[PDB]
Amino acid sequence: NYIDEVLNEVLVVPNIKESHHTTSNSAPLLDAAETGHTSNVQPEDAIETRYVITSQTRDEMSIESFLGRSGCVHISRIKVDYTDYNGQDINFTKWKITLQEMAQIRRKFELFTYVRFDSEITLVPCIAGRGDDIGHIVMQYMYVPPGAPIPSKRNDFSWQSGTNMSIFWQHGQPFPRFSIPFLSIASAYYMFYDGYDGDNTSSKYGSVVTNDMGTICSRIVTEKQKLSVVITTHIYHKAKHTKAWCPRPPRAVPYTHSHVTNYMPETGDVTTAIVRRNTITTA
Amino acid sequence: NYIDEVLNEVLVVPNIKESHHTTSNSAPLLDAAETGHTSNVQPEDAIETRYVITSQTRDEMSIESFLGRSGCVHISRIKVDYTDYNGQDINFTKWKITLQEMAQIRRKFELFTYVRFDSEITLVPCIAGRGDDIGHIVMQYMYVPPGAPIPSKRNDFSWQSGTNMSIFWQHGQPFPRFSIPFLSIASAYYMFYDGYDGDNTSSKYGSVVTNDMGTICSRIVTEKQKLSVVITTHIYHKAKHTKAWCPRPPRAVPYTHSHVTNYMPETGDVTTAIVRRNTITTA
Amino acid sequence: NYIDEVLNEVLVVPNIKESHHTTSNSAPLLDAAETGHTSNVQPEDAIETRYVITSQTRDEMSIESFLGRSGCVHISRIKVDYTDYNGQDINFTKWKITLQEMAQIRRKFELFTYVRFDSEITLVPCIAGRGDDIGHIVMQYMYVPPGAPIPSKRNDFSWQSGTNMSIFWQHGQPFPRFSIPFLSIASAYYMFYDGYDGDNTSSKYGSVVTNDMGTICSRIVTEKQKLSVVITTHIYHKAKHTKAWCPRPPRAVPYTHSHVTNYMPETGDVTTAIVRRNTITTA
Amino acid sequence: DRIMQITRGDSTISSDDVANAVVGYGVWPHYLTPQDATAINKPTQPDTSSNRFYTLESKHWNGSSKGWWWKLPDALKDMGIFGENMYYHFLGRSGYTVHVQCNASKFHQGTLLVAMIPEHQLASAKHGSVTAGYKLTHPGEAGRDVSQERDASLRQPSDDSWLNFDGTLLGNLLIFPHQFINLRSNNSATLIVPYVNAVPMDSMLRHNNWCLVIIPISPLRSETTSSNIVPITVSISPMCAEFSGARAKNIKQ
Amino acid sequence: YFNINYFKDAASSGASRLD
Amino acid sequence: YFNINYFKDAASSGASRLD
Amino acid sequence: YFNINYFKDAASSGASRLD
Amino acid sequence: YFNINYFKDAASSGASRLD
Amino acid sequence: YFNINYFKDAASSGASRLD
Amino acid sequence: GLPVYITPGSGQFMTTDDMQSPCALPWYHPTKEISIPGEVKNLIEMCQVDTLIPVNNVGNNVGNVSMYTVQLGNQTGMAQKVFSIKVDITSTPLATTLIGEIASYYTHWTGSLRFSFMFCGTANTTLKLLLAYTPPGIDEPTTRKDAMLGTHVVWDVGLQSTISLVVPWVSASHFRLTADNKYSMAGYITCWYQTNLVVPPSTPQTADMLCFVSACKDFCLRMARDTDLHIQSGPIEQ
Amino acid sequence: GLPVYITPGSGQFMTTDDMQSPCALPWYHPTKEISIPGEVKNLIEMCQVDTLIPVNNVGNNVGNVSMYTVQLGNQTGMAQKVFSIKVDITSTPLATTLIGEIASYYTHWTGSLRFSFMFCGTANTTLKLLLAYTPPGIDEPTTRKDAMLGTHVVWDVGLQSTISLVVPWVSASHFRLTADNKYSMAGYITCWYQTNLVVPPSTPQTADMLCFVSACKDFCLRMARDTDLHIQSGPIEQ
Amino acid sequence: GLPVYITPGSGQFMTTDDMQSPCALPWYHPTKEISIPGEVKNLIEMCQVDTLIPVNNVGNNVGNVSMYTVQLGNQTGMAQKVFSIKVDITSTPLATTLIGEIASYYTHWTGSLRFSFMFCGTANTTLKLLLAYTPPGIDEPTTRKDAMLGTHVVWDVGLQSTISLVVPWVSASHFRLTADNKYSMAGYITCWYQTNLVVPPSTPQTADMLCFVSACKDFCLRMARDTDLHIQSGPIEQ
Ligand SMILES: Cc1cc(CCCCCOc2c(Cl)cc(C3=NCCO3)cc2Cl)on1
C-alpha cells in the first residue's frame, strides 16, 4: 500500500507480450463498430510485438488527480468607500454560489453529467494600498445559505452569525482555508439538467433550478480608515473525495454566462479549436 | 463510534415500513388532543406506504450543534483620546456580563427555560487607523467579577491582576480565545425568572436578580501614541458542553432592553412575523 | 486522579449528616477559647440538621491557586533619547529585585511568614510611537545578580552576557517568558525578618538584609533610530510549585516603601478598611 | 375509561368525565434528596395537613372573557397551614395537582386551554425597562385578568393574551404542560407537576416557580338564558411540600 | 486524533460527544 | 505519518485513496 | 496530555499537583 | 526522530540515505 | 520529552549529559 | 525541534469550530448539577409536539386569537370548501409554529408531517369534513372531486373529536429546502365538507375547529443557518 | 514537517495559565529545603481559626481596641437587646476578620459558620444571654420574642465561659456571592438578655464579652478575584 | 512546549496539496449516495472509447459534419493515395477527439493507439485500401510502395466493415510529450488504394468511410497541466 501509494504504482498498465506470426482464420482486426461497442485489438494482435514489462501508473489519471486541484472560481472585489460607510449594498460583497461563472475549471467537470464531492475552499485576500498606510484591515467571510438574511448593507444583524459561518482573517495571519461536506438535497451535484421550474412557459430550465446554494455576503470589519484601499479576495476551490458518473464530450466553444449551454456568440461566427487543412493528402 | 461519529450517524431516524390496507375497527387516526398529549400516528398508519430505509441523522438537531456556535454578544469600542489620558471613565471599557444585550443568539437560548454550559470566548480586536501610523497597540482584557475593584480609570491598581484574569493581545499575534467553567451559584443559568429582589414594591424582577456576573473593564496598555485610533474589540461566544431543560415557544416580537420580556414598542403597533391572507380558501 | 483532577474534586469537604435532639449532659457548645485552641462545633451539634451530600472542592483554596497567578510587580520604562545615546545611566534600565515595590500581590504573600517557590516570569513590552514610524526595535533583558558588572551605561561590556542571561524580543514575536529556580541561600524566601545587618546602631533591619538578589539592567539594542519612542516593558510574576509556613494576619493599612512595615502616613490619619456604625443595635 | 378519583388530604375530588391527566415533564412530584440538597437543617414536612386539596375563588366564563391566570406559590398564600408555613420559613419547596372544573351542558360549545409554565416572566404593558410590580404578580386565590381595568401608573403587566403575556405566540404555548376543556367531551383538566427550578428549595415569597394559565380559545356559545352562568373553578394541592429556615414570620401584603 | 485534552480543566475541551 | 484526521468531520480530510 | 516536561530543569514545569 | 514522511509523494522526503 | 534528535547530524543536539 | 509546516487556514477564526482553549479560572469546581425534571437533548423532541396553527390568517383577525380557530359554518351549497394552506413548512400560516419557527434555523427539511384537527363544536352537533393533501405537481384544487383524487382522509366528527391527517413524504430529492423554492414545493392541503354540520334544536350552527401540526418520526433537518422569522431592527437597550 | 494549524488563542498571555517556560539558570540545584514547623497547604486552615470581631463598630471606639469588646451592662428594663451584625461575611464589622479579609479574595462562599463568645466578666458574676440567627427573608428583629422564633442558642454564663453559636447554612442557591447582593443576603445574628448580669457585692456591674468567628467544615470558597478591603492609593516608595 | 522549528514552505498555499481543513458545518450528515448506473474512476476509460475523427479537415467542410467523412472515390490512376494525418495526438485533426481533448490536460503521453475505419459504402460495393503507420524518422510518404515498407495493414472491405489499425509504440524515450515537439514526433499514418472501389450497376461510385481512434491498454498519461484546445477569451456573464 505504502510503497504502492508512495511510489505511486497503484493502477498499473499491463505489459506488451511477445507475438509470432499468424496465418490464421480469425481476424481480430475486423469488428463492426456499428454495434456501438469498442474494439479490443492490441499491439500483440496486429504486429509481431516483443516483450516490454511496463511501469506506468494510471494513478494521475483518476477522477481525483484530474479533479482534486484548486481553481479560481471567483474574485470578490471591494473598492472601499469612506465617504458613505454602510449605505445600501456597499463595502460588502455577496455572489451566487457556483462554478460556471468562470471557464478552465468549469470546462473540466462538465466532462461528466453528475458529480459529487466534499470541497476544499480557500480564500486569498490581497490588499491593494491606494493610501499611504493600510492599517489593520480585518475581514469577515460568510456564507448565506438560502433562505437567510443576506446583509442589506455592511452592518446588518446578520453579521452576528449566531448560527452561521464566518471566517475571520487579519493582515499577516495566513490564508483562510476550510472544507465542506457535500451540500445537496440530491445524491449528487447536477452539472447539467433537462428540467424546468414548471409548466410556465416562462419557467427556468438548466443547472440551476438546481443550485441555489447560497451566496456569500462579505465584510471588512475594521470600521472607517483614513487612507483608502481596495480588497480582492480570490476564491479557489478543490474537490476532495470525488465521484463521477456518465462522461461527456468536452466543450469546444467558448461559453458565455453560466447555468446555460448557450454558445451563439455576439455576432462573431461560432468558433472552435479545429484547424483548417489545404489538403487531406499531406499533414 | 468513530464511523458513527465521523460519518455522523449517531442519532438515526427509523425507516418507513410497508403497509397494506385496513378495513378494521381500531382507528389510530382518531385521538383526543385535549389530553394535552401528542398524537402518535405515522405514514404507515394513514396510507399504504412502501419501504424506505432511511439515513438521516438527527445529529445536527442536538442542543449542542443548535447551541454550540459563536455569536457577537458585544462590541467593545474605544475612541481613544491623547489629550487627556487616564481621566475618569476613559480609554478603558467596562460592560455588564450578559447576552440579552443582543438578539439572534438571545433568541436561540430563550427557546428554553434553563440552560447550563461551559462557554468558549473569543475576542476579535480590529484597529482602525485614523492616523498616518498605528504603531504597536497592545491590549488588556479582564474580567471583574463582583465585587471587585473596577477600574475608575485606565491605570487603577486593578490592572495589576495579582489575582484576576487579564488576557493580552498585541497587533499581529492572533485572536485571543479561551474558555470558561460554568459560573453560577445555582445548578443552571436562569434564562428566565419569576422572582424579585424583595417585598419592596420597588424591587427588581427578572433574569437578573440573577446574573450579576461581572463586568469587563478594558484597557489599551501601550501609553500615549501620536496618530489616533479607534479600537473595536468584538466579543463572540460559544456554548460547549451544554444542557437544556423545559423548552419554550420562540420569540416573535422584536425585544428592546435585556433581562426583560417587554415588547411594547415606542408607539409603533406590536409587530410580528405573521403575514396576512386575503382568504383562507386559497393559499 | 484525572477525573478527580480534571473534574477538580481533589480536596472535598465532608457532608452534613442528620441529627436528632439532645437532652444530654455533655455540652459541645461550651468550650474555653482561652486555651487558645479553636472550637470544634458543627451544624449537626447545635441543630437538628438533615443530610446533605456535599460536592465542593477546596481545590481553588490551595496555596497554589491562591498564589499561582501572574501579577505586575514592576513596570520598566525607557523614554529614549537620540540626542545622547549611551551617556551615563541612560536608555537602559536597572531595578532592584523585589516584590514589596507594588501592593495587591505584596499583600497576598505577606499573609505568610515564610514562602518558597519557583517563579514564572513574563515580560510584556509595549512600544509607544511618538514618531511617525517605530522601525524595528529589538530588546535585551538581563539579569544581574550580585555582585556583577551592572551596566554603567547602555553598551558596557556586560551586555555580552558571556555567562549571564539575556532574553531578546523583537517587535512581532511574542511575549518573552521563562522560569526560574528558587534562588535563596536559605531554605525559604524571607517575606519578613527581625534581624539586622549588625550591632551598628545604624544597621539595616528588615526583609532585605535578606534579599539582594539582583537587579535588572535593561537595553534596546537596535542603535539610533529617527522617530522617537518610549518603551514600557511590564514585569508579571507567577509562583509555581509553592510552599508556605506560618500564616499571618492580612494587611489593613496601605503601605509606603518596601522591605518595611511602616504605615504612618504623611500627615493623613492612619486609615483602615473598618467602617463606622451609628449603633451596635442595628446592622 | 374516563371517570377519575383523586385523594389528597382529608380531601377527595371526583370527575365522571375527563381527558386523561398529565404529569409535567413526565416526572412525579416527590421530596428532596440529600444529594441535590444544599441547606443543613431538617425540613418540616406537613403531610396531609398541608398538601391537601384547596379550592380557590370561582370565575365566570364570558363570551367576552379573555383569560385569567393564577401564580401557584402565591395562589395559596392564605390556604391554611401550607400558607403559614410559607411565611414562617425562608425555604419552601413543593409540587402540585391542578383540578380545573368547568361544566355546562352538551348543548353548549366552548374550549379552554389550560397550561402550567415554569418561570413565567411577564412583560409590562408599557414600553421601557420597567418590570411588572410585585403586588400585581401576587394576586392570590383571586387570580388576575378576567378582562379587567386598572391604573396604568402601576408597573402593570400585559393583560395581553395572544402574545402569552411574555410575547411568544400563544399556540406554541402547547409546549408547556397542558390540556383543554372542550365542553363536548371534557369536564375538567388535570395537571400534576413536580418542582422545577435551578435550586433545591427557593423562596416561597419572592419566587413563584409555577404559573398557570387558562385561556378561552373557542368562545362559549349556548342558546340559553344568560341566567345560565358557567363558572370555572380551580382546585389545588401542594404535594410533597417541604419547608425549612424557620424563624419569626414574614408579613402579609 | 483525540482525547488529548491539552488543557488541565474540563471546561476547556471540545464540544462534547453525543450518545 | 497518516490517518490522523485531526478534524472530527469526514468532509475534512485529505484527498481520498485509490483502490 | 501531560508529564511532558519539554524542559530539562524542574523549576520549569506546570503548576504542581495536589495531594 | 525519522521516517515520518509527513508528505504522501516520495519525491518529497529528506536527502536519501547511504549504504 | 527527550532524545528526539530532530536533526540528523550529531553536532546538532542539546548540551550533552553528565556522568 | 519538530520541523513543522503551518497550514493554510492557520490563525483563522471560525464561528463553527471544535477546538480547546486555556481555561481562565483554573481549579474551579462548578456548582453541582442537581436533578431537574424535563431536559431536552434534541430539537426533534420539540418538533414532535403539536403546536397550534394560525390559519384564519385573515386581516383584522390576525393580531388577535381567533387567528387560530376556523369556524365551520352553514353552507347553503353542498360539497363546498373550507380552507387551504400550503405545506412548505416555512410559509405563514405555518412558519410561526414551534416547528416552522425552528425549521427556519436550518436550510433543509425532510420526512412526513402531521396535521391534527379538533372539533370545538358541541356534543349534540355532527359533521363530516374531507381533508386532503395535494402533492406537488399542480395547482391547489379549485374543487373537491379534483382534490379527493390524491391523498386524503374523510373525518367523522363524533365522540372522538380529533382526526390526524398524515402528509406522506413525496419528493424527488431525498431532501427539500426550507427556503421558498419553486422546485422544493411541498404542495397543498385543503379541507371540505363531506356532509354537513347538523345540529338539533337550539344549538349554535357555526362552531370552530382548531388545527395543529407536530412532526413524524420520519422527520429530520439539517444545515443550520440563522432564522428568517425574526429581524432585530433594534437595537436593544438598557 | 507536521502540517499544523495555529489556533485562536495562540500567542496570547493569561495571568491564569498553566504552561512551562525554558528555565534560565540551567543546572541549578536549589538550597535544600529544611524542615520548618508549621506549613499551610490550604487557605481553609486559616479560615477555621477564630479571629476576633470588631463589633463595637462605633465612632471614636473604632480606631482603638475597645472596638473588639462589647460591654454587657445594667439594663433597667428586662428582655432587652445587646447587639446585632449581619452575616454577609464581607460586611464590616465582619470583613476585616481573618475570614472576611480572605473571602474578599473569592467571588463565592458557602457553608455553615461559627460564632463564639467569651465572658471577660468576673468569676462571682453571672448572666444568661440569648443569641440568635435570623435567616434571610425578613428584617433584623426589633424584639427578642420575634428573633427567638428562629435559630438560636441560650447561653448560660458559668464556669465554662465560651458559648459557640452555629450559623447553619440556609440558602436557595448552593452558593452565595461574597459581594454585597440583595439576593445572596445571608441574614442577621443578634444577642439579647435572657436573665441579667447579677453580681454580688463589690464587683463591677458592667463587664465585657469578646466575640469571634471561625469557619465550619462545611465551608468552602471559589472563583478567586482581587480584594475589596485594600486600595493601594499609593504608590509605594523606596 | 514542544520546541519546534517552522520550515521553509510554511504558510504558503499550493493549488496542488493534500492537507486537511476545519470543516464549517460540523455535524452534517450528507444526503445518502444512491446507486447510479455508470460512474467513472479513471480518465483512461474515456480514452479507450473510440470517438470520431475530423479529417476532412478542409476549408468549407470544417464547420459542418462532412468534416468527419472521407469519400472514397473514383481514381482513374491506380495505387493512388487517400489521406494522411500525423500521429502526434494533440494535432488537429486529432486534438478535438475525446482523447486529444484530454491528452491536452497532461504534459506527457505513451503507449500504442488504435485507429479504426468503417465503410459507409454499399453492400454490393467492394474495395481494398492499404493503411500505414510511418514511424518517426522521415517524411510522410509521397508514394505507397515507400509507405508499405513500414507498419501497415491491408484492409479488405467486405461483410465485416470495420478494420482497426494499431499504432505500435515506437520511440526512444519511454515517454513522449503531448506538446508539439520536433523530438517527440510520433510519425504519420496514411491510407491508399490496394485495388479499387468496384460497384456493380447502378450503385453510386463514391462512398464514405468514417474514421476513429480509441486507446490501447498500453496507453497512459501524466504530469497534469491546463489545456490547449480552449481559450476563454471571455469572460462569461450572468
Ligand atoms: C455546477 C456547480 C458546481 C458546484 C459546486 C458548488 C460548491 C459550493 C461552493 O462552496 C463554497 C461555499 Cl459553500 C462557501 C464559500 C465561502 N467563502 C467565504 C464564505 O463562504 C466558498 C465556496 Cl467555494 O455547484 N454547481
Ligand SMILES: Cc1cc(CCCCCOc2c(Cl)cc(C3=NCCO3)cc2Cl)on1
Ligand atoms: C441570559 C444569560 C446568558 C448568560 C451567559 C453568561 C456568560 C458569561 C460571559 O462570559 C464572558 C466572560 Cl465571564 C468574560 C469575558 C471577558 N472578555 C474579556 C475579559 O473577560 C467574556 C465573556 Cl463572553 O448569562 N445570562
Ligand SMILES: Cc1cc(CCCCCOc2c(Cl)cc(C3=NCCO3)cc2Cl)on1
Ligand atoms: C519579598 C520578596 C519576594 C521575592 C521574590 C523574588 C523573585 C525574583 C524576581 O525574579 C525575576 C528575576 Cl530573578 C529576573 C527577572 C528579569 N527580567 C528581565 C531580566 O531579568 C524578572 C524577575 Cl520577576 O523576593 N522578595
